């Protein structure tokens, strides 16, 4: 699929997601979808 459901993959919704954390979509709204490692 295009676009992945941010919600199962269990990623954290950032307002200003920075470099360090990577992008792998958006959030519902006013936030993106990233993943910290």
Same mark, same amino acid.
């Given at each position: 699929?295009? =676009? #992945?459901?941010?919600? #199962? *993959?269990?990623? *954290? !919704? +950032? %307002? #200003? !997601?920075?470099? +360090? @954390?990577? =992008?792998?979509?958006? $959030?519902? @709204? #006013?936030? =993106?979808? $990233? =993943?910290? %490692?």
């Amino acid at each position: 699929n295009s =676009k #992945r459901a941010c919600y #199962r *993959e269990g990623g *954290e !919704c +950032l %307002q #200003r !997601c920075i470099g +360090l @954390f990577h =992008k792998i979509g958006t $959030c519902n @709204f #006013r936030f =993106k979808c $990233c =993943k910290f %490692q």
